[PDB]
């Protein structure tokens with residue numbers, strides 16, 4: 001599309017912001033607030049519409065995990081509710097295959113989900129599919145060649161370096177090669193034939209390292225590290241480059257946005273968000 005949308009997040013409390021960054025001119029636009037504040041959500045796009053999935057409203061009033069699915073139409077600058085998921089899912093990951101939204105893992109209080117469910121926009125319906133082999137919150141999710149990958153996270157006891165792949169026509173999950181780093185709350189995305197995992201928390205430190213999985217070789221390789229360590233970052237791809245947005249570096253809720261050029265294997269700072277925050281949802285679609 002043309003703009004990078006960032007929805008929600010956390011700073012002092014869960015946020016309702018929807019802001020759109022335009023890489024062509026450096027500008028940020030503030031758009032219609034989410035109806036309910038949420039951090040730990042995920043964003044995705046189907047048919048030009050932006051969806052916000054799951055998360056949690058951490059507020060002074062209290063703290064409520066979200067099962068919600070909401071749809072933002074850039075033409076109208078309006079959010080509409082969709083059908084809710086079977087369960088609340090904070091610290092969720094999502095991926096889109098063939099116009100359907102897969103919601104993966106996440107938490108409902110102390111419940112760490114392995115369950116996975118699929119949304120069909122044409123019917124406004126969710127249905128459960130086979131669960132993952134592992135409970136995963138803070139799970140990175142990406143789609144490559146119409147297969148769904150769940151990467152890292154936290155299973156209730158340990159942060160994970162494991163990853164697995166969902167084969168839709170078999171409704172089956174299988175482990176893939178584990179990452180070389182334990183990562184929970186990483187940013188995961190796809191670029192060319194690789195799944196990238198950037199940042200996260202390894203149980204001790206927020207990470208700046210970045211590694212990628214080549215589906216043909218089934219191996220993970222480190223690339224250039226980000227300039228800033230970060231967990232609970234937003235991540236997306238725009239014209240062949242990876243953008244990482246915000247996160248937490250152990251000291252500060254970051255406003256930094258970095259951009260990875262895979263041809264030069266370099267990261268550069270490209271803009272700052274209007275305020276530091278973590279736990280955002282991010283996706284790319286047409287300008288409003």
Ligand SMILES: Cc1cc(C)c(C)c(S(=O)(=O)Nc2cccc(-n3ncc(C(=O)O)c3C3CC3)c2)c1C
Pocket residue numbers: 009010039040058091137138139153154159184185200201231232248278279280
């Ligand atoms: C109060 C508070 C404080 C801080 C520092 C943050 C970041 C958030 S937050 O909204 O950004 N929360 C969030 C979003 C996405 C993923 C994760 N997440 N999932 C698993 C783990 C882990 O520690 O294993 C994490 C952590 C490593 C990132 C967590 C909140 C509410």
